[PDB]
């Protein structure tokens, strides 16, 4: 295949809700070992979010049956949870190695938006690993999630407008990280509130090509703040 054909396959796979196909095409595109265009970046993220998501869903269901069920069935439930878990971990590692070995690694200096987009993805996929991890393994992935979000945050503060959708979406997930993973509801509300306030303070920084995305994520920040407070 050529690159155009892989990307066309990803677009078709998306429409067909065949997300394993979509992710495999976008991984192949990444493995051509060149930067991704905005569209390629978005296709990659959409593909893997869908793959990790279903299971992020299946794991919650089987974990819940496990908690309600736990007679000894229990062996099965537990085995099946662990199978789903291992799939979910392998998906995350699949993305994290694309990020570490290609996308972050080779991102050019002036491509701040890409940098922040990939560091946020790195935070996200360590956070998905943290959702299922326990013990010392949890401590490690939690540290790695926060390190990735923190670096994304520093770059975005320096190089992007407070209204930029990628900066706003980062604040959204970083604050979810504080709320849900670290159970630090003050640190979560402060981050969300700050990101919202800073965007509001600068509506004049909305872009004619992205203002709908900016305002949508502003509302998402607000929705979380309201829930949490």
């Amino acid at each position: 295949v050529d690159r155009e054909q892989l990307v066309q396959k990803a677009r078709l796979a998306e429409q067909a809700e065949r997300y394993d196909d979509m992710a495999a095409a976008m991984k192949n595109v990444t493995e051509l070992n060149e930067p991704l265009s905005n569209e390629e970046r978005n296709l990659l993220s959409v593909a893997y979010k869908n793959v990790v998501g279903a299971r992020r869903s299946s794991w919650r269901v089987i974990s819940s049956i496990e908690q309600k069920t736990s007679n000894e069935k229990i062996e099965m439930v537990r085995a099946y949870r662990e199978k789903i878990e291992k799939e979910l971990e392998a998906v995350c590692q699949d993305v994290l190695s694309l990020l570490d070995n290609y996308l972050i690694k080779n991102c050019s200096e002036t491509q701040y938006e890409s940098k922040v987009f990939y560091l946020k993805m790195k935070g996200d996929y360590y956070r998905y690993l943290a959702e299922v991890a326990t013990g010392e393994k949890r401590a490690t992935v939690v540290e790695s999630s926060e390190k990735a979000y923190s670096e994304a945050h520093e770059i975005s503060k320096e190089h992007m407008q407070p209204t930029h959708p990628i900066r706003l979406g980062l604040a959204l997930n970083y604050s979810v990280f504080y709320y849900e993973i670290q159970n630090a509801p003050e640190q979560a509300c402060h981050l969300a509130k700050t990101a919202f306030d800073d965007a509001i303070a600068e509506l004049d920084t909305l872009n004619e090509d992205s203002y709908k995305d900016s305002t949508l994520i502003m509302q998402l920040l607000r929705d979380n703040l309201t829930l949490w407070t």
């Binding site: 677009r11 998306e14 978005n42 296709l43 993220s45 959409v46 979010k49 869908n50 998501g53 996200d124 979406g169 959204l172 997930n173 979810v176 709320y179 849900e180 994520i217 998402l220 979380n224 829930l227």
Partner: peptide, 9 residues
Amino acid sequence: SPSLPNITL
């Protein structure tokens, strides 16, 4: 969840 909605293509 409370996290960012997946991108619309």
